[PDB]
Design a protein around this nucleic acid. Structure first.
Ligand SMILES: [Mg+2]
Ligand SMILES: [Zn+2]
Lengths: 200, 191, 160, 52
RNA sequence: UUCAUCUAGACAGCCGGACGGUGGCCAUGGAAGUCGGAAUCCGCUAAGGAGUGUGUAACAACUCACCGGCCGAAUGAACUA
């Protein structure tokens, strides 16, 4: 019975193509449902977020490419967890609304670092017992009456580089959040031609 | 059901040469050469392009074709084992009694010596199997690095280190003392 | 220590001076007299006597400011308009009094801001949805049926 | 006193397992059948009783 | 043998998520899904149970049904002798 179940979804994507003239293909990776749950709230009425599994979607376009052939450039850009934010309103205000949600989540395990962390001088307050992290990674520090003291800005990891388990676990109890969480606009489909979101 | 023909592919990287007789596999790589006898498995190897070898069984039963995938895994371990190497990380677990472990030589035998295990006055002796290197890694408290070409020698000797430190006459659930492998990886980082 | 502001969202029994055995374990640590919390809650929750209603407390560096959060489940109980219940002896009190369609809307309208629903019709479904668990009958019409009627269009929900 | 990570690691080998009900044999935590022939390779398994 | 899932993307795996009304209703001192009693809702949704579990005095905190990427072709359940 999945066929009639799947087909109804197939129709819903079809309709959005005609009336909505733009898209925001966004790299929504590493966002909670809770966080993404409020994302729907602000978008009320102005726009909508359409998403499905790429497997059916990429085929589904081909069936729609029969009459609307202007979707070739989408094919490479449809990879991973990506949402089609169809747009019938000025594109600039869309992203501004979208980028708003920027909850920095502290040292999320597994997450790839999006920022060149500058570890400025911070007195930890951490106990001597757990300091095994500190000694293992070098991290010149001094346990001053229990309170460890970060000396100076050192970039252990950089943007786009996975934080190693050692520092990743170490950074958690320090509660610094380099992992600003937000829907990451990669490209923008505009009236027949998808362009990188960077420009907009 | 006696599958007519079952095939598996073993990938050969550029820097390795493999010479296999009837069942005697000789893999030659950057850090050494490893050998194994496969006379008990009754399989067929054949080249494809000198960078891919096919291992084949014709008329294989449910049990017989099961060993085919083993041979792929068993040989592939050498291919990555002579190129990228094997290292098992061990931590000691001790509540009160620190585990006194070091390297001692008796008649040139390179025995790993253990003292004071849970207050035990036995001196535990575990041989270091041929080819595995034993080293105490600093920057991590109570950690051993066990490395070598062959996964069989490194892992089994690693198990023998674990097996000699079983707690006796006691609640294993609370007296959690022992030496346990913490990580199973490759010696070369991200190679 | 003037400044530090802290929120302490927690429901409290209405129209009564709260149970000392339940507020002291939690409120006490934050430096507030047990007597004070009851009088603030009791008068604020007077109309909600015998009804546990969610009440946030603005807590300002050893100071308090209570505020009854407009909880949908708590507020719908008010809609049934039941004077103080003798719950002490009235075991299994089933608040199923009848309520006209509009009264759901105004509770729903109160929840329009916080709920993300595109329509009050969707919002009414939630307040109907809670009333399903609450058990209230809605103008002698099943809340599930009304919710279908919301989709079916027979009961025209005012947009405002 | 052992560090909790080390305690969990030791329990992975000492406690985080299952037991054959008919055989009392110690079996891997997610094994489906008993490994010892004395119990008929039974699927009657129970979790290892935890601390307290 | 019967029934199901399957290139309109199957199972497995790394995990690729797991909200809101709401701390649903009665009682337990304390049960916030998860000690017990009644019924098993709606909304955003790709989807999330008035909750399969661990668990807290209660929260909490994980974890799981549900599917929340990637790889790419057969698989799952119950019975039969
Ligand atoms: Mg005893
Ligand atoms: Zn058994």
């Amino acid at each position: 019975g999945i066929r009639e179940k799947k087909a109804e979804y197939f129709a819903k994507l079809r309709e959005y193509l005609e009336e909505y003239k733009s898209l925001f293909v966004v790299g929504v990776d590493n966002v909670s449902s809770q966080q993404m749950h409020e994302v729907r709230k602000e978008l009320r009425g102005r726009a909508v977020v359409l998403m499905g599994k790429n497997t059916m979607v990429r085929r589904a376009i081909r069936g729609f490419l029969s009459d609307l052939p202007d979707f070739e450039k989408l094919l490479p850009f449809v990879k991973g967890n990506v949402g089609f934010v169809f747009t019938n309103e000025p594109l600039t205000e869309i992203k501004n609304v979208i980028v708003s949600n920027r909850v920095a989540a502290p040292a999320r395990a597994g997450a790839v670092a999006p920022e060149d962390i500058w570890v400025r001088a911070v007195n930890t307050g951490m106990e001597p017992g757990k300091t095994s992290f500190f000694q293992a990674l070098g991290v010149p520090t001094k346990i001053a009456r229990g309170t460890i003291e970060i000396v100076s800005d050192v970039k252990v990891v950089d943007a786009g580089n996975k934080v190693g388990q050692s520092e990743a676990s170490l950074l958690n109890l320090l509660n610094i959040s380099p992992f600003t969480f937000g829907l990451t606009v990669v490209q923008v489909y505009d009236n027949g031609q998808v362009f990188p979101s960077s420009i907009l | 059901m006696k599958y007519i023909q079952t095939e598996q592919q073993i990938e050969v990287p550029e820097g390795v040469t493999v010479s296999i007789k009837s069942r005697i596999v000789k893999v030659v790589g950057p850090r050494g050469t490893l050998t194994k006898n496969l006379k008990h498995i009754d399989v067929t190897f054949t080249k494809v392009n000198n960078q891919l070898i096919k291992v084949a069984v014709h008329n294989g039963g449910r049990k017989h074709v099961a060993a085919l995938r083993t041979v792929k895994s068993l040989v592939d371990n050498m291919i990555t084992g002579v190129t990228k190497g094997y290292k098992y990380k061990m931590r000691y677990v001790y509540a009160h009694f620190p585990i006194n472990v070091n390297i001692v030589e008796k008649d040139g035998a390179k025995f790993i010596e253990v003292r004071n295990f849970l207050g035990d006055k036995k001196i535990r002796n575990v041989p270091v199997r041929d080819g595995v290197t034993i080293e105490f890694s600093t920057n991590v408290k109570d950690e051993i690095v066990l490395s070598g070409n062959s996964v069989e020698d490194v892992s089994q000797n690693a198990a023998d280190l674990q097996q000699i430190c079983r707690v006796r006459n006691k609640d294993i659930r609370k007296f959690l003392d022992g030496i346990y492998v913490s990580h199973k990886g490759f010696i070369t980082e991200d190679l | 220590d003037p400044n530090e502001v802290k929120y302490l969202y927690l429901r409290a029994v209405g129209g009564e001076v709260g149970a000392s055995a339940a507020l002291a374990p939690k409120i006490g640590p934050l430096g507030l007299s047990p007597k004070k919390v009851g009088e603030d809650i009791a008068k604020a929750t007077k109309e909600f006597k015998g009804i546990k209603v969610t009440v946030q407390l603005k807590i300002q560096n050893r100071q308090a400011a209570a505020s009854v959060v407009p909880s949908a489940s708590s507020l719908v109980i008010t809609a049934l308009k039941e004077p103080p219940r003798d719950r002490k002896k009235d075991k299994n009190v089933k608040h199923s009094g009848n309520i006209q369609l509009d009264e759901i809307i105004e509770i729903a309208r109160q929840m329009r801001d916080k709920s993300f629903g595109r329509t009050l019709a969707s919002v009414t479904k939630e307040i109907l949805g809670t009333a399903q668990s609450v058990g209230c009958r809605v103008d002698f019409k099943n809340p599930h049926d009304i919710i279908e009627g919301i989709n079916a269009g027979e009961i025209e929900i005012p947009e405002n | 006193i052992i560090e909790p990570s080390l305690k969990a690691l030791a329990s992975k080998y000492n406690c985080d397992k299952s037991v054959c009900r008919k055989c009392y044999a110690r079996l891997p935590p997610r094994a489906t059948n008993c490994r010892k022939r004395k119990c008929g390779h039974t699927n009657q398994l129970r979790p290892k009783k935890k601390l307290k």
